[PDB]
Design a protein around this ligand. Structure first.
Ligand SMILES: *SCCCNC(=O)C(C)(C)Oc1ccc(Cl)cc1
Ligand SMILES: *SCCCNC(=O)C(C)(C)Oc1ccc(Cl)cc1
Ligand SMILES: [Mg+2]
Ligand SMILES: [Mg+2]
Ligand SMILES: [Mg+2]
Ligand SMILES: [Mg+2]
Lengths: 236, 5, 236, 5
């Protein structure tokens, strides 16, 4: 790998610089290099890895949606034939997106998840595995689409099981996992009732635990609770 | 789109 | 080149899709491929080339400025030594930026400018040559910095000479050229008085010609005139 | 920064 010659600490330092410069592709490459050093990641380092790839894949997803919409309209009745270019370019972006997802999933499988024993790390990585299978599911149309969806579900479910046993209901990782798994139900698994039930129960159980928190922890938890509420408002 | 983190 | 097998028209079509998807690196690669087909570019195609590289290099410049500011602060008195990483990463971004500028300048030199005979194309390309030498000058610190600055000046000056002879004072290319050459004077050549004089004279001569224009041309010209006014307000 | 186009 091209980062093999750079010190782990230097990769982390440059990932932080790349974040400040809004250079998220660089940030992700630096964090991939850091993961490949083989040591476990601290909480802050896991956050850097997450932020970097979230921004990269988020831009790819937004572009894929623009192109998919154009392609959809080109196939409606009365549209002029414009050739293969829209499909080709949507496929190009899609293949790059799948490459990023495969890279993240590869880092999780080799070997972040298997070395993650504390709930804070293990739930975080399993949530990420669910997220990146979900992004693969957003673009999938083939023989393995059901298996891709089930891979996302299975990762989210293992993360959910650990988080309920090992984390308080206000833990931001537990909350963000529930938020995203709820979106999985709504947008991927055709299960809006499960999505709504999960969001509501998560919100209510967090509400009941806020009294235990410091002011700073309260701020962190209520931020994600508001996202759950936002989705509930969108869906009801 | 709905919110995710 | 990787675009050598794609039809010219398909490259242009995909450049427009890339613009809609905000994929400016792709857009620039498609337009580079289109230029390398060897045919002259239409007005619309010149605009696509300009927009693509403006967005790519604009992002690189913004990142370079963030990193340069961090590097500047790290060298002030009382700052902790953090190692070579800030300089290395600023240099990485700088080298990529210079690569983009060299690519644009290479397309202009081989062979867009030499085939551009109409004022609308020739002024446009010479303005672009001045702009990309200006971006090289923003990061230059070495033996050739004065020659880089003079290359920008010379290209802008040839564009200015043609535009005064061949275009009305309200022509948007003439206006944008003057806007940018004025910025060159202010920010690169340490000539704020020349910058101010050029912006004011350009604005006033355009004002006096607006009466000749249609409503749509008036909108185009006054948009750039407002940028000249904005800079004058910043500088006075 | 000043305006350019
Ligand atoms: S990619 C890490 C997400 C960046 N941070 C966030 O979006 C907020 C502030 C909501 O925090 C968290 C905390 C825990 C998780 Cl699993 C996700 C986001
Ligand atoms: S990269 C082409 C610039 C995109 N368009 C613009 O910014 C406006 C609308 C101001 O139009 C022009 C026209 C002519 C020139 Cl040389 C530059 C911008
Ligand atoms: Mg060692
Ligand atoms: Mg495909
Ligand atoms: Mg032919
Ligand atoms: Mg250098």
């Amino acid at each position: 790998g091209a980062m093999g010659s750079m010190e782990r600490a230097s990769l982390i330092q440059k990932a932080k610089l790349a974040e400040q410069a809004e250079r998220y592709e660089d940030m992700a490459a630096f964090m991939k290099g850091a993961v490949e050093k083989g040591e476990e990641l601290s909480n802050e380092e896991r956050n850097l890895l997450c932020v970097a790839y979230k921004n990269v894949v988020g831009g790819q997803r937004a572009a894929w949606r623009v192109l998919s919409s154009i392609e959809q309209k080109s196939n409606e009745e009365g549209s002029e034939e414009k050739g293969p270019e829209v499909r080709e370019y949507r496929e190009k972006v899609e293949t790059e997106l799948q490459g990023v997802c495969d890279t993240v999933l590869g880092l999780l499988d080799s070997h972040l998840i298997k070395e993650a024993g504390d709930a804070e790390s293990r739930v975080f990585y399993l949530k990420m595995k669910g997220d990146y299978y979900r992004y693969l599911a957003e673009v999938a149309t083939g023989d393995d689409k059901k298996r891709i969806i089930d891979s996302a579900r299975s990762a989210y479910q293992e993360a959910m099981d650990i988080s309920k046993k090992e984390m308080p209901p206000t833990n931001p990782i537990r909350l963000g996992l529930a938020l995203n798994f709820s979106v999985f139900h709504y947008e991927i698994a055709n299960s809006p009732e499960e999505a709504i039930s999960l969001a509501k129960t998560t919100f209510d159980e967090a509400m009941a635990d806020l009294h235990t928190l410091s002011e700073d922890s309260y701020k962190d938890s209520t931020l994600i609770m508001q996202l759950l509420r936002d989705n509930l408002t969108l869906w009801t | 789109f709905p919110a995710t983190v």
